[PDB]
Symmetry: C4
């Protein structure tokens, strides 16, 4: 009676937006909480945006408050703008993860800048657990939904002061309580900003290598925490920044591998890849289907240019949990759309897209 | 246990407003979402306004945002003003239709400008289906409630680049999923802006001919999609624009037939007709009873001038679904009231009127 | 299972405020709906303010809208300020009455200025009945809660163009549907602004005589509509305007009998009387207990000066319906408190007071 | 089926913030209700801030209203800012107490300045009881949650015109109705601002001595109202103002004993103490663990500096009531954080911290 994915993932032949971002910019209404590190996650009924607040607007500018350095996590329904009257403060935190197990929300937040850093866990309204940095901190949560299968919830936690040598662990939770953890062998790479989905009792995640790779590393693991980390084997890297296309291999792409941005790869057969339109700008977003999976040479069948000119940012998976018509498990993603404002710089608003089995035209969503 | 109309339609001897529009103009409060292509539709408990947002007010003017060209459908309870805190974003879309089958909302939206145009369907929160333009697009939904009978939902979809030769289809849906469609034979006419109701297991609709008619074409069909299209046989055309009264016949009225505006005809015996007060202005709204039905010569018995001077616009049917006192099926309509503002031009607000069996005075609702 | 009063009314030895009015003036927040002809009425769970809107504030002034002459009834929870986000539009109307029968709300509104005047009735969300003026109009509802006993709801409806010769009827409703009505014999008086309560299967009401009396006429009737109209027999009139104390008798007090303001008398033994502090100003509010009932000579035992200086206005009864601790039926009243504003003249806000069996000090509620 | 504490209190090895205060200052949004004498209390599902309103913001300043001297109690969910749209007016009052017994809220408020002073009690929405000052008034409620065990609710009520000789009583309530009261023998001390928790069918409270003590007096009592009042036996006083450390004894600390501020002591073994960082300023907040209990010499094991520089104020206990994971009873506290504003002086916002059994780093929560 706890939640678990439907037995098979739906075929995906295209992606339709279920929500464009609230279309702010160059102006925006007062009383809006401005957000970063937002992601979406759903209960059995509807979906919510989870986010770190960093400011509140009024007259086109930021209210001078302490919101930027006193970081707290908030929640807002997907269908509502993020105002004070409509958003709820959940916990203090600078990064986070959240997921509904069918019964209650499990919410994790990290606080503290270095060795003082620690993670708190909430189950429903009740704080149920804590743990500390083990490798110098700061502890870092993914800013994407954690993954629940039949009452067990899994999240990737990062540690270490440098991308030089980060440490990453899978924590397994029940009732908001750590049952165990496994340290991953990630020698030679960096694996931040994990975004994940579940199917076939497995959990799959796409990382961001901020150290030495413009391709995105992939993690796959079971509920017993047996795992593998693999590299995409095409020659089209998907991080930003990145370099140009190279010949397909299983090697990392190290040209411009430094830095990066949260993003995802649908690790199925067919596999889908996603990235900005060009390598020179954070503009547009392109989804490409690879029939033979991400460990093939990468031959692209379908290719959708969902955004062409609009500046874009982080993206990640989320899964609908209470579908009643689909016999199969749907997959969706959230994506930051970036808008310039007149009075408070650049802002991020989430759009959401879901996979559908039926094909569709290459519509540009800029307008 | 799915919804179906009560067995007989209530006698209608007059129309009372159940909601005047929010009385904005020349001024209006900040944080209001300004709307177009609004209509109402109800669940088993209360009623909602569905609409395409095109702007957000502040200090009497439009916030410069991207709301106008990034079109999304929203929903607000009938009894509330359409503010950010109270309205919910449902789906991206430039035209739409919505209807509650007794269990969940079925919502359709159309997006794309020409051959890229396509329709998405939502059942509850779950996107359940899509289909594309077949005749060049854009696909166009009615902007009025779709019609559900015992779990099957019906809506009219228009296609084609010109009113010159539009194509129109009835789509039949279950669980937000297309079961079939039938193309209508509409050679020689144009049938947009369909607004519909159901009674006696039938569905009846009034169209707007934007090509060659100032009378409104009428569609009647069964759940097996057997249908007929008939022309009103009076000599008093009800579109706007239109020309003067002519001698009653079953011919179309082609004087000023070009263009038009969504509107309705209650296709019963007696039939009710509805139109602006005069042919020269979009002012007032007049409801006229024709005892012998719309295919008679049109002799008018009752005649109510609900608005005299106030500028008016689109209108359409909606049906209450959870009446518990009435033994019979009530019928209502929504109507745009147009208000001039000081700082953002002309706006539309919906009023709603319902039929009652008891007669009433010819009150003018301007004030 | 329909609602009915508890078998006996609680002893009342004093009155405590359960809500002061929102303390606006000289300033008030923007987005507030300004109200008149407000009263309170309760479901089985909590209580609501019902009111006619006449404006919306912004920057201390009235938004220039059409709200004043397009009158609509709204509802707001007692514990909330009356903003757009929190208030609900119910029906168009210039006067009204409302009452919950245990199952649904029955709501009546009157619209139209003279012979066109008519009343509409809502049961839950469903309009269930209408009737017209019979004596020239306008039809007038009390602006206080109607009274429901075991599924039958009663309200006083006034008619006629002059206080010179008004006509008053009791309408009996079930499911928002008129079952019958009885015209009262009110020759020689005027009986507007009825405010009522129920106990012992009876319904009792206090009127306002706008024609020839500064005492308040009292109506008492049964569910079979057998009734009596009696005059208070003290010499202390309670209308405003009024003249000074006179010697106790059953005669009307005609000095300054012209005009008046809605108000109440608790018609029990002991009886309670209520009025402004002095006859020269609408200031303060005084409640006086008369052990021998309102048809005695009026000897006053308890006397509470609840307000001394604050300007006050209309007042009326309401009854809590879902008490679970009290074995007896409580009685409360609402009272307008008048506040001067800097930018939109004088406003009215409701306070609510309830009777308690325990005595209490003569606290002044001005501050 | 009424609420009672879990059988044992959880071990507490540290304190984590479950909510930082809304980070206002130097600026804050309009439409905010500014509050004082706030505390938190929970139902079986979530938690609420209870508070006395004293103003409403707009454009960085206080709206000139009557809110400051017409004092009313309000309630807001912990996770929401305290705006008009989101806060609910409960009762008029200048001090208060509230507690959920598992079924309904019991709410007490005090009104009146001296001998007219009295207390009103609400059970759910129903006013159920009243009583008057017995020793000259004003009656004073604690401004912290009252305590419910199995349907009986207990609160400390203070009386008397001077801290010179205040009188304090325990009132026992059921269904919002006083069953009895016991006067405490508090000769030689003053015991205001009681903040309390329950465990082991006992109720424990920490007072504030505004007369002659910089240590905090402690009250412990049973449901039969057998009680004891004891003095902390360390030499580190916790009131503010206070003097420096002295040698441990059971004597009161009278240096700077005059005045004080609401605050708490966790009266267990180990005991926790809490106070500002230094004696010279109301800055920071420090929690210190005393393994041997508050009646020992006070040897400190753990010591957490939760705030260092930030100005702080009142603090008190609250208990979560609907935990489902913890087998034991959790304990939390609320704490005022003080922020300077540009346009309305100094404000107070509540943060909440809960005890956890796992240890944690000495993180500074200033930023
Ligand atoms: C931990 O993972 C690292 C990285 O994958 C493993 O090191 C690699 O081992 C293979 C041989 O099987 C080499 O071809 C790679 O070049 C190695 N990479 C580096 C940088 O060492 C390592 O073997 C794993 N350790 C354990 C204990 O299994
Ligand atoms: C499709 O509908 C059209 C329009 O009603 C039909 O054409 C009409 O047919 C009648 C004869 O029955 C003529 O009197 C009209 O003048 C025709 N209109 C035009 C412009 O052609 C047509 O027959 C229908 N087609 C089919 C296959 O049934
Ligand atoms: C209707 O009510 C009026 C007013 O009470 C009645 O008229 C009064 O009758 C009594 C005699 O019983 C006189 O003493 C009053 O002076 C009368 N008032 C006036 C102005 O007429 C009248 O009798 C009632 N009519 C009916 C049919 O019962
Ligand atoms: C009421 O409490 C007071 C204060 O605790 C008691 O007075 C104290 O009694 C002890 C002796 O047992 C003395 O050592 C203290 O110095 C006393 N304090 C003062 C100021 O009197 C008092 O005995 C209690 N009264 C009753 C009736 O029990
Ligand atoms: C906000 O306030 C602080 C002073 O209290 C200041 O450091 C900062 O510069 C202010 N922000 C702006 C934009 O002036
Ligand atoms: C869709 O509707 C049909 C109605 O016949 C119903 O039987 C079925 O449960 C619905 N689909 C699913 C799989 O829920
Ligand atoms: C809104 O912004 C864009 C520039 O970014 C501009 O094209 C448009 O004119 C602006 N609107 C107004 C009213 O100036
Ligand atoms: C109206 O009220 C009566 C009460 O006697 C009840 O029996 C009936 O169900 C109600 N009307 C309908 C048709 O629901
Ligand atoms: C409101 O608008 C109308 C003009 O459209 C005008 O008659 C009225 O004077 C205006 N109100 C004020 C206060 O100017
Ligand atoms: C008040 O509480 C008691 C608990 O013993 C309960 O029995 C009773 O039902 C409550 N009072 C009433 C009349 O509801
Ligand atoms: C608020 O209003 C009253 C006058 O009605 C005045 O006493 C007080 O000074 C005003 N407040 C301010 C800040 O001027
Ligand atoms: C935690 O989850 C387990 C699932 O196996 C469940 O049995 C248990 O009830 C939960 N914990 C508690 C004490 O509620
Ligand atoms: Ca990289
Ligand atoms: Ca036309
Ligand atoms: Ca009078
Ligand atoms: Ca002190
Ligand atoms: Zn920080
Ligand atoms: Zn946002
Ligand atoms: Zn290939
Ligand atoms: Zn567009
Ligand atoms: Zn609107
Ligand atoms: Zn005829
Ligand atoms: Zn009017
Ligand atoms: Zn108000
Ligand atoms: Zn007497
Ligand atoms: Zn006061
Ligand atoms: Zn606040
Ligand atoms: Zn020791």
């Amino acid at each position: 009676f706890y939640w678990r994915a439907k037995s098979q993932m739906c075929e995906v032949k295209g992606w339709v937006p279920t929500h464009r971002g609230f279309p702010w910019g160059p102006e925006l209404p007062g009383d809006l909480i401005l957000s970063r590190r937002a992601y979406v996650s759903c209960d059995l009924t509807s979906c919510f945006k989870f986010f770190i607040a960093y400011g509140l607007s009024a007259n086109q500018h930021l209210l001078n408050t302490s919101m930027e350095w006193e970081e707290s996590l908030y929640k807002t329904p997907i269908g509502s703008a993020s105002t004070l009257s409509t958003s709820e403060m959940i916990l203090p935190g600078r990064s986070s993860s959240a997921c509904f197990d069918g019964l209650k929300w499990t919410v994790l937040v990290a606080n503290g800048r270095d060795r003082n850093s620690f993670i708190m866990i909430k189950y429903g309204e009740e704080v149920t657990d804590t743990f500390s940095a083990s490798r110098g901190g700061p502890l870092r949560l993914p800013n994407s939904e954690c993954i629940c299968i039949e009452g067990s919830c899994f999240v990737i936690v990062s540690d270490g002061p440098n991308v030089n040598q980060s440490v990453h662990r899978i924590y397994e939770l029940q009732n908001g309580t750590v049952q165990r953890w496994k340290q991953l062998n990630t020698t030679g790479i960096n694996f931040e900003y994990s975004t994940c989905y579940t199917i076939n009792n497995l959990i799959k995640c796409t990382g961001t290598n901020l150290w030495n790779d413009a391709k995105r590393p992939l993690l796959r693991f079971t509920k017993e925490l047996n795992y593998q980390i693999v590299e995409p084997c095409n020659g089209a890297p998907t991080d930003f920044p990145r370099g140009g296309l190279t010949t397909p291999s299983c090697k990392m792409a190290q040209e411009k591998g430094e830095g990066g941005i949260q993003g995802f790869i649908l690790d199925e057969k067919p596999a889908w890849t996603s990235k900005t339109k060009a390598e020179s700008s954070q503009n547009g977003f392109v989804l490409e289907q690879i029939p033979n999976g991400i460990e093939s040479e990468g031959t692209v069948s379908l290719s959708y240019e969902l955004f062409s000119n609009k500046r874009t940012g982080r993206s990640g998976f989320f899964q609908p949990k209470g579908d009643l018509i689909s016999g199969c498990q749907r997959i969706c993603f959230w994506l930051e759309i970036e808008d310039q404002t007149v009075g408070l710089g650049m802002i991020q608003e989430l759009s959401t897209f879901c996979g559908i089995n039926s094909p569709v035209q290459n519509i540009n969503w800029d307008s």
